[PDB]
Amino acid sequence: STSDLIPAPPLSKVPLQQNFQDNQFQGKWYVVGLAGNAILREDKDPQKMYATIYELKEDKSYNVTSVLFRKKKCDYWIRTFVPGSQPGEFTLGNIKSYPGLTSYLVRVVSTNYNQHAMVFFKKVSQNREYFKITLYGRTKELTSELKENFIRFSKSLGLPENHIVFPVPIDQCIDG
């Protein structure tokens, strides 16, 4: 009653970007596509584009800073992605600081580093299993081919069309 979610896909259905180059994945990515079992299309108040910056620390973990525009201000949130079982996979650092969060997995599905990327996320919060796929763009716009591929991949993981959104480009906060 409290919550009905589309099940997380088995990891076997989520590809891994082969020969992942952590240094090349650094920098700002625009979230041009967003899909997941907690993501819902809202025509009345469409999701605004936000940005996510990846910076490698000395120990090769990522300082992950996301910036979004809401309530007339820029909101920043910082996460740490720690290298996982194989290149392109990560787990969340300092998980204890997040109340109710018992699991968090990141897997880079595909990228050419200089234009686009698809990243799979899976987490367990309050014993509920959430997953999302982000279509990362180096620019705010990507081709119809890349967006259609994202839709196709999202649907292959069991997500319907209304759980797939393409955030509207904005200039506030994310241009810096």
Side-chain angles (χ1 to χ4, degrees), residues 2-39 43 45-54 56-57 59-70 73-94 97-140 142-147 149-176:
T2 308
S3 187
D4 284 14
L5 298 168
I6 296 169
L11 274 48
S12 65
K13 290 184 183 295
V14 183
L16 177 69
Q17 173 56 59
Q18 301 305 300
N19 313 127
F20 180 75
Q21 301 300 123
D22 60 346
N23 61 325
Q24 294 200 59
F25 198 74
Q26 291 181 106
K28 178 164 68 178
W29 289 102
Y30 294 104
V31 181
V32 308
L34 214 193
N37 64 357
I39 303 296
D43 300 40
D45 186 34
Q47 172 68 55
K48 289 176 184 181
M49 183 168 291
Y50 64 98
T52 300
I53 297 83
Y54 286 73
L56 281 172
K57 304 189 286 175
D59 64 359
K60 302 300 194 73
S61 287
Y62 280 120
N63 264 325
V64 184
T65 302
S66 283
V67 63
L68 15 161
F69 182 56
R70 64 134 66 248
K73 293 191 180 184
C74 303
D75 293 7
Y76 300 88
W77 27 285
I78 302 177
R79 255 81 270 186
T80 301
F81 292 172
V82 185
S85 69
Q86 53 192 342
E89 286 195 31
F90 308 86
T91 184
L92 196 66
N94 197 22
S97 63
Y98 306 90
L101 191 60
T102 53
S103 184
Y104 196 94
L105 180 61
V106 183
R107 191 136 97 184
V108 178
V109 178
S110 60
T111 185
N112 72 344
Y113 304 104
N114 56 43
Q115 285 184 323
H116 56 80
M118 281 198 297
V119 186
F120 175 82
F121 300 81
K122 186 180 79 67
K123 65 176 187 176
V124 177
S125 173
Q126 270 75 19
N127 307 125
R128 301 194 295 274
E129 190 162 44
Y130 300 98
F131 75 101
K132 67 170 184 193
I133 316 87
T134 63
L135 203 205
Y136 282 149
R138 222 80 228 209
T139 61
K140 297 176 187 177
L142 291 178
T143 60
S144 293
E145 187 173 326
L146 292 164
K147 291 188 290 190
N149 195 62
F150 172 68
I151 292 165
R152 187 157 59 255
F153 180 61
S154 295
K155 287 178 179 176
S156 80
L157 300 184
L159 296 170
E161 210 100 37
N162 71 318
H163 278 261
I164 302 171
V165 301
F166 294 95
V168 57
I170 60 173
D171 295 335
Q172 297 95 343
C173 309
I174 69 181
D175 281 347

